[PDB]
């Protein structure tokens, strides 16, 4: 999915666990960091339900 | 004797003396009178169904057959269920609101005909309707009845 939509990653979160929308950060360390290309926060797969 | 009596009832109804309601009330209480009469007669011949003697001619006691044992124990069923098995079956009533005047002249041991089984199937389908709707009605009432009493 893209940004600014029903399944957006900037507003809600990632569709997978510990990944970003553009696919730049795939690690496990950062939990409250924001990417530079996309304005999303990398977190768990349960943060779509928060 | 009750068939001769209901033939007398039909002849005095066709002759033009009484209406339908009087003879209808007459048959729906005299057939039940014959029903509990043959029921207590069934209790009598089920209680006195034993021929034993010890150094004597005759001696009467309780019967040594399984029907009288299950009637006196009363585990599952009652005394009104063996009337369908041995004596007169009873008077199943129509589901519309009336009662059928013709009796059950046969029983389950000798063998019923088509007509008495057709009388019995109406009460059977009515009882199946009550047992099918009663579970849903009891659930529908208890879903609010325990819901108000959860405090």
């Amino acid at each position: 999915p893209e940004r600014d939509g029903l399944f957006c990653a900037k507003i809600f979160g990632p569709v997978k666990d510990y990944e970003c929308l553009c696919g730049k950060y795939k690690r496990l360390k950062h939990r409250g960091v924001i990417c530079e290309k996309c304005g999303v926060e990398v977190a768990l797969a349960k943060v779509r339900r928060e | 004797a009750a068939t001769d009596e209901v033939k007398e009832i039909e002849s005095q109804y066709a002759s033009g003396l009484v209406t339908q309601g009087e003879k209808y009330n007459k048959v729906i209480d005299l057939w039940s009178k014959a029903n509990d009469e043959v029921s207590k007669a069934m209790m009598a011949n089920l209680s006195k169904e034993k021929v034993v003697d010890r150094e004597g001619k005759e001696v009467d006691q309780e019967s040594f057959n399984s029907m009288y044992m299950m009637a006196d124990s009363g585990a599952r069923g009652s005394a009104a269920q063996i009337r369908q098995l041995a004596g007169m079956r009873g008077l199943m009533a129509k589901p519309d609101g009336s009662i059928i005047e013709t009796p059950i002249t046969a029983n389950f041991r000798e063998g019923l005909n088509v007509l008495q089984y057709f009388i019995s199937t109406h009460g059977a389908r009515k009882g199946l309707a009550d047992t099918a709707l009663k579970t849903a009605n009891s659930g529908y009432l208890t879903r609010r009845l325990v819901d108000v009493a959860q405090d």
Binding site: K16 | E10, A75, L85, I119, A124, L128, A132
Partner: protein, 1324 residues
Amino acid sequence: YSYTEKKRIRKDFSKLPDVMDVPYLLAIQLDSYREFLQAGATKEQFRDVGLHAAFKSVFPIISYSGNAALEYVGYRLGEPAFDVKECVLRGVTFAVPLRVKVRLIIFDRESSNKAIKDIKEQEVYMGEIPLMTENGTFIINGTERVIVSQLHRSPGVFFDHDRGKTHSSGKLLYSARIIPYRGSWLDFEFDPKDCVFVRIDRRRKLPASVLLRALGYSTEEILNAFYATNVFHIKGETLNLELVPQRLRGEVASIDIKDGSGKVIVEQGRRITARHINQLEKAGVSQLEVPFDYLIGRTIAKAIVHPATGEIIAECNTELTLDLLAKVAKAQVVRIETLYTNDIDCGPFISDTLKIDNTSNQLEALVEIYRMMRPGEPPTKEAAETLFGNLFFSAERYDLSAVGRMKFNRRIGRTEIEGPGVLSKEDIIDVLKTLVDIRNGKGIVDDIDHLGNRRVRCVGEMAENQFRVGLVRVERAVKERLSMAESEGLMPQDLINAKPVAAAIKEFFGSSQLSQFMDQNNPLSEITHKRRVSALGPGGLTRERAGFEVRDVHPTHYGRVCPIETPEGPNIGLINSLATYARTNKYGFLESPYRVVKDSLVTDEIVFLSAIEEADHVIAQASATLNEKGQLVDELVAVRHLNEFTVKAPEDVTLMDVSPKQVVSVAASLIPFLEHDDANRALMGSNMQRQAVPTLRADKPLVGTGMERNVARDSGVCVVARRGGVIDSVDASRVVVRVADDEVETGEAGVDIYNLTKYTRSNQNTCINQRPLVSKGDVVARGDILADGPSTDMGELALGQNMRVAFMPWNGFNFEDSICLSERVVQEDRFTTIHIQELTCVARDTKLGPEEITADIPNVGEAALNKLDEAGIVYVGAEVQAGDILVGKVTPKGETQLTPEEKLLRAIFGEKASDVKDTSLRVPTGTKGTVIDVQVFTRDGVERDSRALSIEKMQLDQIRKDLNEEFRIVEGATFERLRAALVGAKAADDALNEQLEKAQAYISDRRQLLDDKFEDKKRKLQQGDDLAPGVLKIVKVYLAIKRRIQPGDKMAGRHGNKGVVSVIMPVEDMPHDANGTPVDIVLNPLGVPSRMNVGQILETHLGLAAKGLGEKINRMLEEQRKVAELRKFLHEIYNEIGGREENLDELGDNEILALAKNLRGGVPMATPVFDGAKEREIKAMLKLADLPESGQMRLFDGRTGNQFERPTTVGYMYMLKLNHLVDDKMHARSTGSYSLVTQQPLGGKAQFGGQRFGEMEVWALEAYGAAYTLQEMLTVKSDDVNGRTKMYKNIVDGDHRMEAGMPESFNVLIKEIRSLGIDIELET
């Protein structure tokens, strides 16, 4: 005498002789399909209802503001090219085209014979025909689905009481529910305040005067003709009244009617009796004088407009008052039109309904019916008139058959049975006269629980309605497309569209509730699912709409509707069944035949009698004393005349029953001793027999009813013989028979192939197969049984098996109604069953990477790779264990975001980093069996697997083998015919040469016929089938589980005694008699007093007698006696009191040995349902075979060894096997994948979910005073994030702390509540 009766004859006990043979069971759907399809007909087809009647009502059309016409002579049926055994294994769903010839005739739009351009051509195939088989079923996309006879309400108007709490009155009239066949549902409700108001679906209540003025009838004429017919005049003594003696009957006259020239009739204050009525009749005085006070209570019919005054002095349908009578007197009115109503006569409710709401104009009724349809819109007269015409008069989206007009004519009274299909205002006049006659009290009210008020439909009428809807949709589309087109500019084929009728015939069988899946687990289910009469579906009453109205029966169902056949659960009463001898009418009415009897003799002809004449005629009983002279010996019999049982005279009756098995359906009639059982447990036993499963060794039933061979004959799984003759060779895959010279044509004499059904899959995942029961070198007859299906043996229905059965509560194993088996049933494999389990795996194509059947699958061990080949499919007949990979399916993946633990465990073992996952399907828990075959479907023009090549090459060599064997048998028949022809006068010569050339032409024609048949088979097996879009290959593997007897299986008999087996108890723990045969399955003696069926004891006594006679004939065959002793043994068997003897006919060498070898395993009985075997013949059969007469055997204790001081009862009970096992219901799940809306587990991860822990479960949990498990089962077992992790860590580490935490259910609730913007905060 059939050939199957020589091997097995049944000892009947019918004291009444059989007067009518059992008719065809599935003939109703057969001739309904023949009427709707019209496959075999002449050039002049029938004018009945069907596809032709639906096409002829629409296909003549006229273009709006133009000139166009479409004519047709008929259609052409398609040829079914798809074989049934190849479409159940390929998925063609029996496709059949249907082409029609349309004649596009143009005109000059001048209503003359000018510019007649006719184009007669054949159109495209309008959809696909279902093309059902002769058995009565059709395949819908792999599976077999059947139709159900919709027992909805009959088309017409009914008038019932319907006393409910909404009326709040003792005597009230219900609403007249006008029920058409399709669309235009109108209502007519009677208001309690002497009024009538019609109703609609979405509109409000409307008066009947507005409805009459919208239909066309004026309010004044309707109010005049509704109440009475009386005119009032002003002549003589200031008034002139027309005296009617019928209206004044029973009315208390409070005034003086002394007119009649000095002759007083009734004085003031005298009640009118029959003497005053006779005095008025003998007088004949039509003019009487009443005072002016009596005219105040009367109501006028029409408006009084005097021509001398020029103004309206009295309104239409208004009451007369003291000033209004003076105005009518001073206006010089000659004739006054008013209604006359009395208290003893009918109440004037129609005038009070017409006088309400000031409805007297046609434009007011038009705008009222426009606001009722489209409220708040532009009120136009033409648009509202067109809407009313399309709703009532026109047939646009409204189809009514002739049976509704026939029922309306039977209700309101008419000499013509056939009526018009379109509704008119005259029918509204008849229904208003009928409702005011019902409100008057004359006549009898209709019963909604009657057989006449519930019509039994079929697939033909609903299919014709759906085809008519699709055809008028296609006609509207063609009229919209050909609006601005021309004759030379457009095309007749391009203007028509076969797509809406194809979509309609798709949704009629795919998404319809009436076309449900056929219960093919048992042949009883197969023959009863056609004969189901359900009230649900479209245009009917559902489960919550039943109530106490349609769940009850009326005694007019004598031989029509069987109430001892309905599925148990949430729906009993509204889903009914069809009786045995009940035959439907041409009008879809349920009728039953009856024997016409005169006052002295008994007639021979039988007439099918309807239900409307049985309420007036007398119906006697066939179970009466007959002295072989055609008269009743008794002077009083239980008869019925006015739909109620009573006593009558033998010289007064006119009709009687044909057979006692005409009232029961085919489900319950297979249970013996129906007259000794109650209908509740007989219904339960019939339901478990309908839900039965076949067995391994089909043992014949001991106590039979006689119709077992009949229900094996009408079943489509059996092999019926078309032509008789000798049998050449018998094989388990196919059988062939020879054709005699009598019933054969000139060319192609011997041609008879019969492909036996191999082990394929049924609908309830059970195996079906055909077993031959004939030999080599025997003659058969027409309709003979060659190979029997599942749960059928040697020509008769043989569902289960039999074993020694006693009635004793033994050690609590048969505790309440439970079962205790023995080791013989597991050591001989008697009641074991084998299920075929399906596993449908797909091989789709994704956008990131395609999938294929590749054997090189990662994460596959040695035990999984040893079973599958280089293709990827396990071989034919391999042992499949629990947790085995069967199909090959590798799916790719990209950007999986793998963890360091996964790459660490991948680098430790040294395996390659495979980015393609393995999503191959496996078996569920508890399935460990052997596969039998695998069916593969590929797309057209795609890569094929080598296993698919092996499957198609095996299928083609099997097809070529059966083609070669049928070519061999037909060339052997031709050579033996030629050899039988040449021996006659061998020693003219031109004839022999001619016959040899004709035989050479015949065998070359057969050779080229098998060549084109092989070409058709190759072009149908090499091509691709229509599958789901996005699928490359569809595989399905058929796994067969060899299930045995396990502790906990379901076991019920035939009289509704449900039970579960306990354990595998050995053969010694059961009590044994002195003969040497210990009892096997011991039952409880509570089934006879509690459940009201004593047929258990009679059936087990006849089973004991039949096993005694079987052991006697077995030791007689062992003792090597002569055939004279065997025929004397059969003579002393077949000469009882009941039934008849059929001895001294069979030959000793062949037929006696055949009946010995086919009756050594038990003998069947033949008992009717209501005049069956009496007890004295059973006492004779018990006493003739060295058995006790009351079943009072003397048994020996196997456990303790003490002698019983009481005689016991043993015998044989023929029980059934159920589809209520443990393996299909077992859910094995410890941890399951949680859901998406909450953290609750569910299926889909190759593991079945748990049960519903709803409201009643947690209510019973907090029924006790506890609180810790209520939150433990709610925050640990489900609805948490880290609570399950910390609790599992506390379980593993050992120490417990019981931290509270925070569940996710509160998070889902606070998100769903804050989605509406609600302030929720915590104080703390």
